[PDB]
Amino acid sequence: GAMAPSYRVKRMDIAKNDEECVVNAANPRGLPGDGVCKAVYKKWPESFKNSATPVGTAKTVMCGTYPVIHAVGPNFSNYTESEGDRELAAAYREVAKEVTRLGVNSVAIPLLSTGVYSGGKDRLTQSLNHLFTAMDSTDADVVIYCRDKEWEKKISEAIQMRT
């Protein structure tokens, strides 16, 4: 575990992370995809061997010895708000199981279902709160990756609020 497990946020490409493993915002079919998934495909293409997994699950595949945790958030275009919320919570619980199993001291994680899968809604608070519910009981250093300057401030404020 980390000596004083923390949450941090960085605004940059998750393919440049400084952590012991990465969570991919994957699609269920293990396809290269877009956004976080395409950056992950470019950096760790070997990790997409047999990475297909259902919605609400995570499947880890090694790129050399570096673990890529493929986490499949729901596409809110297809799910009801209610069923989408259940699957988004579930995907993060499966990420916490994998991070624990791998014995890493740190993990890079994007906010699931906040981009192309958001159904055109702002889901920062919803996705971040499911991330916390899952990860609070782990002792890995969690580093959250985002792209948007305003999201960086809101994530930073949410982390600081609880400290």
Ligand X SMILES: c1cnc2c(c1)NCCC2
68: contact with ligand X by CB under 6 A: no
Residue 36 interacting partner from Cl ion, ligand X, none (CB closer than 5 to 8 Å by kind) = ligand X
CB of 84 to ligand X, least distance (A): 19
Residue 117 interacting partner from Cl ion, ligand X, none (CB closer than 5 to 8 Å by kind) = Cl ion
13: contact with ligand X by CB under 6 A: yes
**Among residues 62, 115, 132, 154, which is the contact residue for Cl ion, using CB under 5 A?**
115
Distance CA 140, CA 99 (A): 8
Q: Which is nearer to ligand X, 39 or 134 (CB)?
A: 39
Tell me whether residue 73 is annotated as binding.
no
With a CB cutoff of 8 Å and minimum separation 6, the contacts of 4 are: none
What one-character DSSP code corresponds to residue 47?
Answer: G
Burial label, 13 (beta-carbon count in 10 A; 0-12, 13-18, 19+) = middle
**Among residues 1, 2, 8, 12, which is the contact residue for ligand X, using CB under 6 A?**
12
Number of residues that bind ligand X (CB under 6 A): 11
Beta bridge partners of 107: 142
What DSSP letter does each residue of 110-154 carry, written as one string? E-TTSSTTSTTS--HHHHHHHHHHHHTT--SEEEEEES-HHHHHH
Tell me whether residue 115 is annotated as binding.
yes
Name the site residues for ligand X (rule: CB under 6 A).
Answer: 12-15, 35-36, 39, 110, 145-147
